[PDB]
Nucleic acid binder design. Structure first.
Ligand SMILES: [Zn+2]
Ligand SMILES: [Zn+2]
Ligand SMILES: [Zn+2]
Ligand SMILES: [Zn+2]
Lengths: 66, 103
DNA sequence: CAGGTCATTCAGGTCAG
DNA sequence: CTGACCTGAAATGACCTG
């Protein structure tokens, strides 16, 4: 996955991504609000840490193209 | 996830952003809910040891340790959000009228 | 692979001890 | 008062639909 560490279920929206970042981004823009990092957009998005920060994960989504 | 970052006991996952045990989770929740902290007063110098056995010996040191490690006092629902939750759960229990609506 | 499911995986309340 | 145990909302992420 161009976002976390997990395998990609092919391409979705703006890049190949996992069903986790897929579902995550699938839900985000639809029922959209505004995530806010509790830290300083440093949160390393990886398989074991991806759900920790929705800000970084979202920005990370649109950042790598989506 | 495995051990409580506040006292070292076995933890039950994330609670208020930190890996904690049911003990520190409950204590934190109740201190914030009832604003009990101001009355907390260490009876020596705030250097008390907080471990899985001594955690209840000094309420102030235990709370200052919960803050230090990063427990989020903002994840403890205020009265409007807490009451909204109870309201929701009670009214949801209206699955009762549907059960009887089946037949 | 846009599309939906929808079983599964952290809050407040409880009450014995 | 504490905390082991519980209830259930809500979010995640697997797996199907055409
Ligand atoms: Zn991913
Ligand atoms: Zn972040
Ligand atoms: Zn603890
Ligand atoms: Zn003390």
């Amino acid at each position: 996955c161009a976002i976390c560490g997990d395998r990609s279920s092919g391409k979705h929206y703006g890049v190949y991504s996992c069903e986790g970042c897929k579902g995550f981004f699938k839900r985000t823009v639809r029922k959209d609000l505004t995530y806010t990092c509790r830290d300083n957009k440093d949160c390393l998005i990886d398989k074991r840490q991806r759900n920790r920060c929705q800000y970084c994960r979202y920005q990370k989504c649109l950042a790598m193209g989506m | 996830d495995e051990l409580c970052v506040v006292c070292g006991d076995k933890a039950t996952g994330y609670h208020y952003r930190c890996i904690t045990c049911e003990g520190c989770k409950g204590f934190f929740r109740r201190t914030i809910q009832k604003n009990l902290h101001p009355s907390y007063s260490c009876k020596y110098e705030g250097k008390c040891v907080i471990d899985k056995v001594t955690r209840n010996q000094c309420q102030e040191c235990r709370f200052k340790k919960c803050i230090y490690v990063g427990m989020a006092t903002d994840l403890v629902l205020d009265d409007s959000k807490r009451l909204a939750k109870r309201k929701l759960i009670e009214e949801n229990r209206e699955k009762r009228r549907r059960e009887e609506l089946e037949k």
